[PDB]
């Protein structure tokens, strides 16, 4: 996250931190995600497409720090890893960049709400807030585009939803932003998602409720004028989501 502020898991208790175990026994951070029900975390397909094997991944909830333990955290295995079958990666952008992880503890339990863990509501199908609405993004992504290390403490910031009208302008992203995506940025362009934030939530208030409206996908640079963050438009994937989740 560029700009914004350090925060703790209690302010973003749906945030899921996803790691991959290495054949060495090294474990490194992969991506963010969001807890949409006790057994289900949603993220981006591109985080896993390269290594698509559920066994290699661990999911933490209740975790405020990247490489050290938070009290109240809970560790989970991936029971199944559901990528999107129409996922595609272009020269610039990702398409249908959405994924599901079913989580279970070694004990066999799903997530349990807590000071530090809570589910986040899905929006109603095709129901998204209006452009200019302020939303929150969270993650362990780079604090600057040029950095080589990731921050150890979770961060969040506030961005504003952009119209497709405006996001399609050629000096923005042109034809490369489709209606299954959502743009969001700071009007002054000083805060943004960045590398390492992918899979994480864009959260807005939609008719009273804190709702999962986007999933961090791609953007050009970070906090670069005229180049906003692009997110998977979650309202457009409920059928996909319910098919795989109602099980």
């Amino acid at each position: 996250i560029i700009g914004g502020e350090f925060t703790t898991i209690e302010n973003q208790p749906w945030f899921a931190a996803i790691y991959r175990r290495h054949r060495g026994g090294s474990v490194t951070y992969v991506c963010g995600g969001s807890l949409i029900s006790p057994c289900w975390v949603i993220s981006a397909t591109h985080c896993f497409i390269d290594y698509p094997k559920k066994e290699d991944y661990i999911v933490y909830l209740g975790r405020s720090r990247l490489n050290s333990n938070t009290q109240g955290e809970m560790k989970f295995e991936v029971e199944n890893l559901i990528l999107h079958k129409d996922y595609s990666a272009d020269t610039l952008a990702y398409h249908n960049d959405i994924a599901l992880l079913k989580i279970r503890s070694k004990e066999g339990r799903c997530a349990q709400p807590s000071r530090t863990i809570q589910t986040i509501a899905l929006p109603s199908m095709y129901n998204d807030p209006q452009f200019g609405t302020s939303c929150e993004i969270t993650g362990f992504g780079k604090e600057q585009s040029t950095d080589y290390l990731y921050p150890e403490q979770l961060k969040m910031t506030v961005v504003k939803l952009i119209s497709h009208r405006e996001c399609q302008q050629p000096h923005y992203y042109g034809s490369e932003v489709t209606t299954k995506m959502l743009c969001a940025a700071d009007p002054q362009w000083k805060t943004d998602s960045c590398q390492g934030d992918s899979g994480g939530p864009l959260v807005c208030s939609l008719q009273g409720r804190m709702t999962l409206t986007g999933i961090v996908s791609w953007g050009r640079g970070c906090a670069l004028k005229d180049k906003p963050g692009v997110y998977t438009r979650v309202s457009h994937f409920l059928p996909w989501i319910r098919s795989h989740t109602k099980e």
Binding site: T91, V216, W218
Partner: peptide, 10 residues
């Protein structure tokens, strides 16, 4: 990797 990916491994 897409040129605009935010994925840490790219």
């Amino acid at each position: 990797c897409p040129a605009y990916s935010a994925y840490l491994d790219c």
